[PDB]
Design a protein. Structure first.
Lengths: 140, 140
């Protein structure tokens, strides 16, 4: 059972999410990222189960990463779904900010507005080792 | 003296460049990337010497990565200068393609058109371990 789930937006956060996975694994964490560990079966169920299994929920906030959550009242966007699961389960949520513009909470669906109240970590290209160190400090 | 120099465009390939650095270091290669190894002094001298010192020249071709070299006739662009140094020294050049559109040689400065004759490796987000294994096979 992975200790860390990485939630990310494919068109903008795939490289940072993979970088996070490598570093966190190096430091002994079991990491779930879809390209490595999502296997056979119905992916909606499997992805929600993988969020529930992981104590830590790492959210890659690349530019525009929550755009597709906006107006997603039916909760059909996969990132929206992962965030709501992490919130409902009381996970240790750790946003990673990489060029992200913080939206006002009221443009997001009410069931995920609480994600903006968690302390985030700013990915520093120039100080990557220290960024990783900070993430590890935040993980449980 | 590091075995691998990583040349990349900061605005678009920083994440992939750092992902490549970590993976290659984990496989025992000594890697030069500016944010970790460029130290004090006049940076234009140091970066040229660093290209000269590394047997392998890993070129991160993220989207539009050569745009700033086009019509850079006085060769003031840093990626342009790094490529020219790699070609001039006959380094083992290994282009990494990630959403890159191959330009026609006419649009590039004459002293770097030869970079388009080297066999490149396509970055696959879904098959990253295989991509890394292929890069390692290309390295000397």
């Amino acid at each position: 059972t992975p200790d860390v789930f990485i939630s990310y937006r494919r068109n903008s956060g795939s490289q940072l999410a993979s970088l996070l996975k490598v570093h966190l694994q190096l430091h002994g964490f079991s990491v779930f990222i879809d390209v490595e560990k999502l296997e056979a079966g119905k992916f909606e169920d499997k992805l929600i189960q993988s969020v529930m299994g992981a104590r830590n929920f790492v959210l890659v906030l690349s530019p525009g990463a929550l755009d597709k959550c906006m107006q997603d009242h039916d909760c059909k966007d996969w990132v929206h779904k992962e965030i709501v699961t992490a919130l409902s389960c009381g996970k240790n949520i750790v946003p990673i900010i990489d060029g992200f513009e913080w939206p006002e909470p009221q443009v997001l669906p009410e069931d995920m507005q609480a994600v903006l109240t968690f302390n985030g970590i700013k990915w520093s290209h120039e100080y990557q080792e220290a960024t990783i160190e900070k993430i590890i400090r935040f993980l449980q």
